[PDB]
Structures are given as C-alpha cells and as structure tokens.
C-alpha cells in the first residue's frame, strides 16, 4: 500500500579495483616501503594494516584505535 | 614438469594450504608461512606486476610465472560447472601462494629440485 515518507535505501558498498597496491610503495630495486601502520595487537601479528585516517590511526577486526 | 605443480595445487587445496588472492599473499608474505607461489604474465598490470615481483624478492618466497590468468583459474578450479565436460566460464587469478602441510607427495621434491638448480 502507499505511505507518506519516502523510502530508506542501503549503504552501497564502495568497492575498490586492485586496493593492495595502494597499501605499499615499490621500490626501483626488489625491496619495499610500507606506507600505513602494521596492527600491534596479539590477534594479528605483522600482517594486517591500519587505516590512515586524517587525524587518527584505526584497525577493523581487532578494533584498535590511536589519536595523535 | 607442470603436472608435478598441479599435483602440488592438488594436495595445498585437499589439505587447504593455499592461501591465494594478492591480498591474502600480502597477509602471508608479512606473516611468513609463503614456500611457492605462482604467477601469470602478458596481461594489462605494468606497475602491479612490480609490486608483486618486489614482495618476492623482499625475502626467501620463489616464482613460477605462466603466461594466462585463465589457465591458472582453471587449473586451481574456481568456476567449475559441469566437470562431466569444459567448464563453463572461469576467472583469470593472478597471484596464488601455496603451503602444502601434507608435503608427504611425488611432486614437491622434483620442484624443489628445479629450484635447487
């Protein structure tokens, strides 16, 4: 039936094509330089990376946050 | 000597010891469990290809490059509809890094016999 207000839509994920390149920086030799902060929790080891935020440093799964 | 390879892809799929995808690669080669990974080439990645290169260069982590993405999808087996014929329609993958735990097999030995030469 017709109602008043109109409808609520769902967050559309905005997904991203080849997101790991942006997370390191290559070198012209066969080394690295690792852009964004590596998880200091137990869960993950050295593996995941945090979010670079514009004032703050976060981590999804372990939940980790770290103002400035 | 890829049927040695596909029997390696064979035993880190049954014990499920792959742990595939670039960023799942990433993940691994930071967490060091990585021992092979395979690669395909002659595709649209310029820089990317670099990136890839770069993390296996950084520490003790081998290459096998194919040529088709396809191929290497359809060899790991992602998009298998009716295996009683051709599959249908399979994705072209990239960067597969496996970790066999059930190691006890005929084909990692002459593979890493390959790679002591």
Known sequence: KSYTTPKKNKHKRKKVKLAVLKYYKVDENGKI??????????????????????????????????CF | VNTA?????????????????????????DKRQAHLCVLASNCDEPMYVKLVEALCAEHQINLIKVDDNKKLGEWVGLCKIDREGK?????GCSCVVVKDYGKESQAKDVIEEYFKC
Request: glycine share 8%.
């Open chain 2, 5 to 29: 390879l596909q029997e390696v892809l064979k035993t880190a799929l049954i014990h499920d010891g792959l742990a595939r995808g670039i960023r799942e690669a990433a993940k691994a080669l």
């Open chain 1, 33 to 66: 330089s690792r852009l964004r902060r590596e998880c200091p929790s137990d869960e993950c080891g050295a593996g995941v990376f945090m979010a670079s935020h514009f004032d703050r440093h976060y981590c999804g799964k372990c939940c980790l946050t770290y």
């Open chain 2, 87 to 91: 599959p249908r329609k399979v994705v």
